[PDB]
Structure 1
């Protein structure tokens, strides 16, 4: 077999999953109406191999197969974050701390802007359709959850928009559903960059004609950074090229001057209008609910051209209860930038993480106790400082509870996080509300309350640092096997386990 580069090539990613027995190619006929979404949910929820649906009801031979669960978790024996590690070309047993640390290190690597390659060398240009051949209702788009407001074609593709001055090209994921044979509608919301750039076009009188492209099965490294809140004005493509160690190969669109990854599976191109809008949603989302008939108008994308590979594959994420891409990518990549913001702001933080079990609503910060002790501060002052740093920034938007814990907690292990949460904070008394800050509108306790109208508040910083830990060493014993007993005893016990009679 060829040397695989799963960060760079979506098809190498799929092959490396097959080589690790972490991909099931499903060749019986599967219906895109619900059945694909249900198979995906069963696979996410038991951390099972990713389904590749090779035979969808209503598909043509090229349009399309579906790869579900591209950044779902899997069994610990093969690297439970191996699919995420493969998006970055890392070893599959890389830990989540190492994945986050690698993305931070890559911010100081030289950015490598995309390289234009010839069309004859771009698989995405194998088949090219002009406007009259666009028939979006022909595609076997999945209907992913009961009560969704449409069929969501765009759950794990990349939108490409560029500012009118051409200085900033943004790549990002935002959901999109098929409206009719020529149009898609989807979320284009503050504070996201896709709406900052669409607003720039509106500012020069072009709100109804914003060029875009939509790319599926892009280089896995590019879809991952599409989900990451890197700074405004920074083009994702150049940080993707630093992660890959090589410029992303790109080719020009048929109908506009945007550049798309040459190895994309499918590319749609057209114009977005902020003034022609359409009912969108609802859509089963990252906090685990579909709230019925709770759709709202969103901008319309008019598809004017398409190109695709032979035997094209649509990757799909089907959000809901933990754990799927809206936890493993959205939450971990907020945590990556929250670590970067701690570093920029000089907070004494070792690591940050958004536990999957808290549906990407909790951000845990592991605090360096000696650095905290150097501040000679109190919990009330520190909680305020921390909430003021995060809750009025775009990185903090999705977060509703920031939990502060000492450096003896492995924040990437929810068993330690829930222990430290329940045992180390006094309910209410150790929580600081932040009432003026922008609420995240998708949190269900916001959207199903009168807060949905004010859109402020409902966030807190919770102190799970004991008062003594703000001042000095505080040595207690953690009553479990691995931490509670001396290493020589732990090892003796583990060595004799079988001899005792354990089977």
Structure 2
């Protein structure tokens, strides 16, 4: 019973109904103010912002800030993530990652090609296809230039057209016709780009902004090599995604897009050949930084879902997995089921942490995990206070730490200059599992230390 939102207009109408989006009619400068407005919103847990009037381009193209920031909906901080993934506004952290991990066990659903889409109501070709017609947000003071892609999806196919990857990567503006961005060889955009370099031809590309809200989550997900995001999205929502043919390149793009930037990557510069957009386009942005923004609510969250699916595929009894937002997507929490010993009869607590480390180390996501804490599932790892309490009271100050050295996340902060320069540094797995213990010996709180009738009576008096 999914509640898939089919485009950004539907997503915004649902946020509006829950008073979780605010319109700003005063002029906002894309030079630093739009980015600062997004940071204020994340950090104060404000409503998403629709910047209706931007210096330089006026009311032509709106900007959506904090598209999946923490929500203002009372009692539902994950509501933007939940709604983006077609779940109830009050879906829990565990229901979200479990829904994504469950879809990894299902067969991919091929998309369907539609003849027309609102994203092509307006078409700009040749010299008219110029990025100077749209906002060029300078998101942070020290950035190298305007970051045109922070929440949109890059689409590239292999030369034969048999495989297509969808990915969010940062793209910076050079001028009105050119953009640039990194093509890491360990990522899929780079692997596909190498195939176009071997044939000696420019790689065709498309960048879509403001699609249905589920796409940027799956485009952030580190799926295995050879698994298409569009197929996974189809299996996740239980129906085909509708794609439309691009106007100047042989690529299929989401029909739900607000804006489509088409072109070729020269053998790294993106060259714009066409820009298509629906009437009154909206360009979402994501302003990465300290917690909590979409680096944490989308990228780290879908990385936790992928870890949960990989650990379960290795038959480990993992109740849930989560990348705590306060740890800025540097940490993975792995919670084992209460009966993990019955499910894995031959291993001690140290043994199951060794096995988790071994399984995670064989996957694509291992370098992202600066720390993995292994805990019992009486802890909700999305509850900041309960998670800090469990780590402080269950992880020894000296033992239960399994260090590995190898490839590291170059964006992670906890590395020395030498470790960064070598791309070689430590990653740890910390054992916070308890021995078999009665609920009242490991807890001391309202819900764990008082009989049901006493709690009921207190709830009647106070709630």
Scaled by the length of structure 2, the TM-score of the pair is: 0.94
For residues 375-401 of structure 1, the C-alpha deviation after alignment (integer angstroms, 9 at most, x for no partner) is 343344333222121134212231110
Aligned counterpart, 1:463: 431
Q: Distance in 1 between matches of 2:460 and 2:440?
A: 28
Deviation at 1:317, TM superposition (A): 0.7
Rate the CA distance shift 1:116–1:497 in 2: closer, same or farther, 3 A.
closer
Of the structure 1 ranges 249-258 and 489-498, higher mean CA displacement relative to structure 2 is found in 489-498
Aligned counterpart, 1:344: 313
Q: Unpaired runs of 5+ in structure 2?
A: none
Q: Distance in 2 between matches of 1:490 and 1:146?
A: 52
Residues 322, 359 of structure 1: 8 Å contact kept: yes
SS at match of 1:408: coil
For residues 320-379 of structure 1, the C-alpha deviation after alignment (integer angstroms, 9 at most, x for no partner) is 111111101111101111111111111221110010000001100001242236434334
Rate the CA distance shift 1:76–1:66 in 2: closer, same or farther, 3 A.
closer
Of the structure 1 ranges 388-397 and 401-410, higher mean CA displacement relative to structure 2 is found in 388-397
In the alignment, does 2:446 pair up with 1:453?
no
Q: Unpaired runs of 5+ in structure 1?
A: 276-298, 499-503
Aligned counterpart, 2:253: 260
Residues 161, 197 of structure 1: 8 Å contact kept: yes
Rate the CA distance shift 1:6–1:53 in 2: closer, same or farther, 3 A.
farther
Deviation at 1:199, TM superposition (A): 2.0
Residues 348, 372 of structure 1: 8 Å contact kept: no
For residues 258-278 of structure 1, the C-alpha deviation after alignment (integer angstroms, 9 at most, x for no partner) is 0111231110111113x4xxx
Aligned counterpart, 2:74: 77
Residues 221, 244 of structure 1: 8 Å contact kept: no
Of 232, 245, 258, which residue of structure 1 is paired with 2:238? 245
The equivalences for 1:308-319 within 5 A come to 308-319=277-288
For residues 30-74 of structure 1, the C-alpha deviation after alignment (integer angstroms, 9 at most, x for no partner) is 111111111111111122210000111111543x10011111111
Residues 137, 178 of structure 1: 8 Å contact kept: no
SS at match of 2:207: strand
Deviation at 1:78, TM superposition (A): 5.7
In the alignment, does 2:446 pair up with 1:493?
no
Q: Distance in 2 between matches of 1:260 and 1:477?
A: 52
SS at match of 1:445: coil
The equivalences for 1:12-411 within 5 A come to 12-62=10-60, 64-75=61-72, 77=74, 79-119=76-116, 122-206=117-201, 209-273=202-266, 275=267, 299-372=268-341, 374-411=344-381
Residues 392, 438 of structure 1: 8 Å contact kept: no
Q: Distance in 1 between matches of 2:218 and 2:425?
A: 29
Residues 78, 92 of structure 1: 8 Å contact kept: no
SS at match of 1:363: strand
Q: Distance in 2 between matches of 1:253 and 1:302?
A: 15
Residues 7, 220 of structure 1: 8 Å contact kept: yes
Aligned Cα root-mean-square deviation (Å)? 2.0
For residues 192-229 of structure 1, the C-alpha deviation after alignment (integer angstroms, 9 at most, x for no partner) is 211121122233334xx111100011122222211112
Of 383, 386, 400, which residue of structure 2 is paired with 1:413? 383
Deviation at 1:175, TM superposition (A): 0.8
